[model samples]
Target: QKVTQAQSSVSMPVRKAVTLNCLYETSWWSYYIFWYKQLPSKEMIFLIRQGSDEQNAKSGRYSVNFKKAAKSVALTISALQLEDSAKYFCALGEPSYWGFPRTTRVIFGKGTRVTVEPNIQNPDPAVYQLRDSKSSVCLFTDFDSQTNVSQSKDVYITDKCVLDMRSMDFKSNSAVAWSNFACANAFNNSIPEDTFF
Candidate 1:
């Protein structure tokens, strides 16, 4: 029996901050929280993970803040950069039953990807390089401890942003669904082509 679930679908303007919140109930003693980014052509980018026993998890500018008492977790992307502009997902992993190996059955909510307008005030920096198939977008940022203020304070892929797509001609549904399927399969270590119909 499913205890609780939630979802959020948002289309945010460029350079704006979007927040993803998830709430759920469970009689289980522990839970694991995971975040994934879905890119074009069914690609999955693992963001961060927060295990129930662990208080929090942070990588570069990406942070996962969780509250056990509230049974909720919030993902914040500060100073919304372009590459930070991708569909983000949150899930809760159920605890292992009896002595069985913990099957990471992650339940996901709707995703949010930011879109930026090409404005003179905010020009899209070709600083971001696109791949041959436009399947992936890559950005290089420093992750040195000296420059990083904290776990959530360093520059990484999300810090110096970029977005890569096959073309600007694809429909929203086709692009989103393909990316979602790719992300799920990739994290599960299964082929997306086999799972996606």
Candidate 2:
């Protein structure tokens, strides 16, 4: 398996947009491509997962163009912000059958380092919610950030309130909205119950 990121590094200004292109090669008939963002603080966040069925899927400002013939997948992030500066990775994996004892190993490509300059005027604002359940916690997309909020609950809030891509899987019950701006001044920094309103 081989994955390639043509651009080793990229620099952009805030509020602008950037696309991170990724290409991969594998002999397996059935496989999937996954994208991940590694923040400067050493947090590896899951971005998106693409299969053959979704050749091109758009989620709000985030989209992926998958080319089966050429074996390529491009990840585009619109409305760039300073928090978007991070290392991105593309990975390849194959699905496993039920009751299978062994799991598929994911092969990752060399990372692409992206840097976004801070903007003093009209700094991007973001808000998100987190739901807690018996087993796991679910992260919701920002209120005005993207499109796939109802379809999926994998959204994660990165540093500076930047929303990451969908998450894997989880079960949830009650949830609370969290605002970096509001919580910034609160003691203990807990999200207020009425914050969701």
Candidate 3:
């Protein structure tokens, strides 16, 4: 019923593959293993989820080696980057059965703190988007010594610009102003005015 990590912490250089191992001691026949990464800024990001029957699951640079017989899961990060440094957690998920509502409670194991050295010379800023039936928001991420964005709303102000999702606008300090209206509308099957940004 409990997922446990043997290693409390791990530190490795960038560009190396590191495996975060986990184990569970239980007699339950069905369950899933969920992996999450918590950044230094306290942002929890979902890494992967593997079913009891899945032996191997892979994503872009992340993979999970699941050993069902041993009740263990190993999360592997290939060619680890500086952004990969974080505290990783393993969780056990119990599914609903017989028409009952799904269980919202997740049992989590002790976090394994991982540290990676910064190796990239000049990494580019990354952009992401979140869309739902009711709203759409854009995220602009860049490396910094301290967190500057406010946690109060969907909008975040960075050194580069102000990302205001409410107004569907990206106001830059320089001359590079942009709009997210087309991007938001595109998520709803509307024809985007410009495809090349």
Candidate 2 lDDT, 21-115, residue by residue in tens? 89887776777888889987888898888886665767666678888999889998888865677999988886665422358777888888886
Residue 130, candidate 3: Cα error in Å is: 45
Model 3: residues with Cα > 4 Å off, grouped in runs = 97-100, 119-197
* Top-TM-score candidate index: 3
CA-lDDT, candidates in order: 0.50, 0.61, 0.63
Of the candidates shown, which would achieve the greatest lDDT relative to the real structure? 3
Looking at model 2, residue 196 earns an lDDT score of 34
In angstroms, how far off is 115's CA in candidate 2? 0.2
Candidate 1 residue pairs in backbone clash = 83-161, 83-162
In model 3, how large is the Cα lDDT of residue 45?
Answer: 92
TM-score of each: 0.52, 0.55, 0.57
Model 1, 32-115: lDDT tens digits are: 777888886668888888887886777766776788899887776645655665677776678677632666577776655544
Worst 10 residues of 2 by lDDT: 144-153
| lDDT of candidate model 3 versus the reference | 0.63
C-alpha RMSD values across all candidates? 16.9, 14.9, 14.8
lDDT of 1 at 117: 26
